[PDB]
Write an enzyme that holds these catalytic residues in place. Sequence first.
Site, PDB file in Angstrom:
ATOM      1  CB  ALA A   1       0.426   2.742  -3.635  1.00  0.00           C
TER       2      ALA A   1
ATOM      3  CD  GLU B   1       2.644  -6.209   0.921  1.00  0.00           C
ATOM      4  OE1 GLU B   1       3.140  -5.215   1.513  1.00  0.00           O
ATOM      5  OE2 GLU B   1       1.735  -6.113   0.063  1.00  0.00           O
TER       6      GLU B   1
ATOM      7  CB  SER C   1       8.027  -1.044  -2.030  1.00  0.00           C
ATOM      8  OG  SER C   1       6.928  -0.945  -1.136  1.00  0.00           O
TER       9      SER C   1
ATOM     10  CB  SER D   1       4.700  -0.458   1.125  1.00  0.00           C
ATOM     11  OG  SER D   1       4.505  -1.569   0.256  1.00  0.00           O
TER      12      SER D   1
ATOM     13  CE  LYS E   1       8.345   0.750   1.684  1.00  0.00           C
ATOM     14  NZ  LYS E   1       7.663   1.368   0.502  1.00  0.00           N
ATOM     15  CB  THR E   2       5.725   5.936  -0.327  1.00  0.00           C
ATOM     16  OG1 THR E   2       6.452   5.116  -1.251  1.00  0.00           O
ATOM     17  CG2 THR E   2       6.437   7.257  -0.218  1.00  0.00           C
TER      18      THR E   2
ATOM     19  CE  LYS F   1       6.152  -4.108   1.751  1.00  0.00           C
ATOM     20  NZ  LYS F   1       6.102  -3.768   0.298  1.00  0.00           N
TER      21      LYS F   1
END
Length: 265
Positions: A212, A141, A105, A45, A209-210, A48
Amino acid sequence: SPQPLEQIKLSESQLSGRVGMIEMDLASGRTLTAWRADERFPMMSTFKVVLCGAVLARVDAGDEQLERKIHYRQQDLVDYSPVSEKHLADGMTVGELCAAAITMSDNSAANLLLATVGGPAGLTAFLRQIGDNVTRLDSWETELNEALPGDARDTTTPASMAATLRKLLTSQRLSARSQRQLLQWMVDDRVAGPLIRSVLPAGWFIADKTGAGERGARGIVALLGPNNKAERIVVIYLRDTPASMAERNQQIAGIGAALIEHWQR
Ligand SMILES: OC[C@H]1O[C@H](O[C@H]2[C@H](O)[C@@H](O)[C@H](OCCCCCCC3CCCCC3)O[C@@H]2CO)[C@H](O)[C@@H](O)[C@@H]1O
């Protein structure tokens, strides 16, 4: 905490995973701490932010408007659509889609936006055009999170991602309003921002922004600094570890803690 590079090494040993990191001055681009900075990691993510940079480039050119509404159908939704699933009847504006993608997200929001820039190939072309010759998006995605071992698809490197974020945020490639919007979306992250703030010492700016993914993939792109200032870009990615999400989070936090405790360069 150990010194930053010491901590990064310990994180690899403990996770039995690969870590990649860069710490970069926002204003100048000076590289400060680096580890595996030229090695490939899934963006997840974190992509993004780059996506919405491309969207803003189109807005600046008058080929897009943040206020334009996009309408879509339930059959278009992919896994994890907390905002977009709520707007099947009325649609969402491009600006709201970027807000949902970055701050929540939202995966369907990201796919709707990705189409506007010509899909994964279009976003990769935008990256080449701003002089990032490394970062690549190949999938939509949620396939872009698969993190297949050794796969070059859907990857960046800490060095390329940091340079690209700096270009988008400060290089005047984006208009003043667009640079400011991209940062504000990151300031507004609801997934990790509040948690991070709650544990950062007083006086530290954070925007983030994270991401996973599979096989332990995890990451963060952030702006960070003391005196309430966004001083440095910090990019940290993890891949190929079997560890719990909790432990991956803790290790990234430990690397952050080491950078903060040992900030003076
Ligand atoms: O290798 C794992 C490490 O885990 C801990 O790290 C601790 C750290 O000692 C503490 O200071 C912090 O609390 C504060 C969290 C700091 C978060 C910083 C945010 C960063 C994240 C990365 C991008 C920029 C902002 O938590 C972590 C995880 O428990 C300990 O230092 C130690 O057991 C070990 O070295």
